[PDB]
Amino acid sequence: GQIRGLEMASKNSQDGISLIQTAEGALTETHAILQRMRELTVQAGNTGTQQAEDLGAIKDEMDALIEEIDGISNRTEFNGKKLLDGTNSTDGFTFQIGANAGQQLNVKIDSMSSTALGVNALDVTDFAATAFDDQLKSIDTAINTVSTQRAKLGAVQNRLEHTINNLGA
Amino acid sequence: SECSVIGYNAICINRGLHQVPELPAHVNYVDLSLNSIAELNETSFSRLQDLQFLKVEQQTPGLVIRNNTFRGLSSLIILKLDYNQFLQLETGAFNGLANLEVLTLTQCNLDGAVLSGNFFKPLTSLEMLVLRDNNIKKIQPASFFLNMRRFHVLDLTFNKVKSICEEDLLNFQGKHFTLLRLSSITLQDMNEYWLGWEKCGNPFKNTSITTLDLSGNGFKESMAKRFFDAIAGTKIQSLILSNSYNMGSSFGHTNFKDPDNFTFKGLEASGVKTCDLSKSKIFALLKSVFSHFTDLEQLTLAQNEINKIDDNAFWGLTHLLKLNLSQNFLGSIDSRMFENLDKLEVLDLSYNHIRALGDQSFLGLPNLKELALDTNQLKSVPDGIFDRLTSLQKIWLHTNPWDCSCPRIDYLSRWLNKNSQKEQGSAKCSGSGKPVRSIICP
Ligand SMILES: *[C@@H]1O[C@H](CO)[C@@H](O[C@@H]2O[C@H](CO)[C@@H](O)[C@H](O)[C@H]2NC(C)=O)[C@H](O)[C@H]1NC(C)=O
Ligand SMILES: *[C@@H]1O[C@H](CO)[C@@H](O)[C@H](O)[C@H]1NC(C)=O
Ligand SMILES: *[C@@H]1O[C@H](CO)[C@@H](O)[C@H](O)[C@H]1NC(C)=O
Ligand SMILES: *[C@@H]1O[C@H](CO)[C@@H](O)[C@H](O)[C@H]1NC(C)=O
């Protein structure tokens, strides 16, 4: 009967890993979109006074990229559960990984929508109202947020790899 | 005993240990991960002299490793200290480890001084160093790296590195890396107007690299061009530039430039045999864009936004064997698209939006063994389209809305029946859902 318990804790650990991998995959997409937004913002800041017509084309692209962030936030799922829209973020995901009850692991993932990341309001045609530095900072804070969430999930994945080796021994 | 000891292996994972436990002298593999060891010193491993493989990953945060902690572990080959948040290393922490081959230190909040200080000086046999996800902002290896003659794998993925230049990587000169993984390090300072470009020189001077992973780094066209000019001459067999998120123009926008013939010119002397430019928002394949890759054998452009392939896009790829265009936005194929690819063996066009194949689309591809057209929008093909593909071994035609009206479907149904051993999966008729191979036109 003790063998069944180890088998179970192990399967639940692997499943935690697959969940985390799905989230890590989506977060790296968010990260990439945010860095492209950053680069577009930089290019906008370097746009000359006679070249101001370019700014509208930049805003168009960033707006579509903000939409993509939201698409990722809303669709990303594992085992029928949304991972990145914040809807599971107060309870979190709980995995039964111990060979006895009580030994347990809870993973919280914050929302990665454009609103939650604070990159919703970006507007490269309006540096006159919302400073370039503030817009860039919003984007950098969002990059840090995504990157920190990914790093956090990496730590939990590592914990789950060790738990699987432990149960096998 | 506290741990689970089986043969040569002591598994001590998650045992609430605050120090290295007592273990049989004959164990050569110890896993102490997920414990609460706050400090290691020379007494810690003084009873385990035969260790070859040691893990002390992810303790409670703040693990301190004192000088000479592993002194006398002269058989240790692999040491893993990953996920020790705020890891505190004394500068002689690795004294005695002349035979160590692998050191892993992922996500330990380390900074650039871990490479520029004396931490790794004792590691004369080191082969592989993993430093992913730390706080390394410049890569500046100390001079002793010059004499680490077996050093060939370095992974710095996820460090936010400002820039890399010749002066930084000096002490890696003369090395052959089998794997140099500089993925997702961003290189944020290396932009269009940075004065460092004038003085950067060649980061990889007199260094050769089997697999150079520069994925996830943006690589805006103008940046790529400057970077590859800087490293011109560097022998690289496999170049990974996947997730170059600034490189492509993107479908429906022209703020950024897609790569062109001048972008990759610096790579002309590198001997590149495989290149991965997947997931990089590329929209157009421009004239001669790949013509500086004179030795190229494999090319993936999967998962871009490719909708336009210019005539002579593949000019100069006279050695190419494999071309992956899967998961793009192609709406059609014509015969000019794939000129200058005479040696091609593998063509993946799956997961596009292709609704028509031009009359002689594949005429310039007699050596083709594998042709994927699954998951497109093909309703028909022109008569005889596959007839000269005399080396074809596999073909994917499924998940397409084949129009099985007669006589439109006559050629394809007869061909798929005659060549049923080549078809992978099963092409089905729209409406009826019967296999295309089973239709007999009268
Ligand atoms: C072309 O590249 C695609 C995308 O990278 C490869 O797709 C992978 O295909 C394998 C095997 O069919 C799957 O297990 C992976 O999940 C796919 N990856 C993704 C991201 O979709 C494909 O194999 C490549 N084609 C060839 C001929 O190498
Ligand atoms: C390691 O730490 C202990 C205290 O925990 C100390 O008594 C011992 O002398 C130290 N070892 C060495 C080799 O200095
Ligand atoms: C640790 O080792 C270094 C170099 O081997 C030495 O200079 C130093 O005294 C040691 N550090 C401490 C804090 O004892
Ligand atoms: C490159 O490194 C090798 C190995 O040290 C050395 O002998 C050779 O002279 C170097 N070549 C150049 C051009 O610096």
Numbering used by the authors:
A (entry chain C): 54 to 222
B (entry chain A): 23 to 464
From the paper:
Flagellin is a structural protein that assembles into the lash-like filament of a bacterial flagellum, which extends from the cell surface and allows bacteria to be motile. Upon bacterial invasion, flagellin is detected by Toll-like receptor 5 (TLR5) and NAIP5/NLRC4 in the host and activates innate immunity, contributing to the immediate clearance of pathogens from the host. TLR5 is an innate immune receptor located on the cell surface, and consists of an extracellular leucine-rich repeat (LRR) domain, a transmembrane domain, and an intracellular domain7. TLR5 recognizes flagellin as a pathogen-associated molecular pattern using the extracellular domain and activates the MyD88-dependent signaling pathway and NF-κB-mediated production of proinflammatory cytokines.
To reveal the structural mechanism of TLR5 binding to Gram-positive bacterial flagellin that lacks the hypervariable domains, the crystal structure of rTLR5N14 in complex with the central region of bsflagellin (bsflagellincent; D1 residues 54–230) was determined at 2.1 Å resolution. Consistent with the biophysical assays performed in solution, bsflagellincent formed a 1:1 complex with rTLR5N14 in the crystal structure. bsflagellincent forms a 1:1 complex with rTLR5N14 using a primary binding interface created between three long α-helices (αD1a, αD1b, and αD1c) of the bsflagellin D1 domain and the concave and lateral sides of TLR5. Although bsflagellin lacks the hypervariable domains, the bsflagellincent-rTLR5N14 complex adopts a similar 1:1 architecture as the sdflagellinD1-D2-rTLR5N14 complex. In the bsflagellincent-rTLR5N14 structure, the primary binding interface is divided into two regions, interface-A and interface-B, which are located at LRRNT-LRR6 and LRR7-LRR10 and have buried surface areas of 550 Å2 and 695 Å2, respectively. A comparative structural analysis of the bsflagellincent-rTLR5N14 and sdflagellinD1-D2-rTLR5N14 complexes suggests that the LRR9 loop of TLR5 centered in interface-B plays a critical role in both bsflagellin and sdflagellin binding. In the bsflagellincent-rTLR5N14 structure, bsflagellin R89 protrudes and is snugly inserted into a cavity that is generated by TLR5 LRR9 loop residues (Y267, N268, G270, S271, S272, H275, N277, F278, and K303). The side chain of bsflagellin R89 is enclosed by the side chains of TLR5 Y267, N268, S272, F278, and K303, that form the cavity wall, through van der Waals interactions and is stably hydrogen-bonded to the main-chain oxygen atoms of TLR5 cavity residues (Y267, G270, and S271). Thus, the R89A mutation in bsflagellin ablates the shape and chemical complementarity between bsflagellin R89 and the TLR5 LRR9 loop.
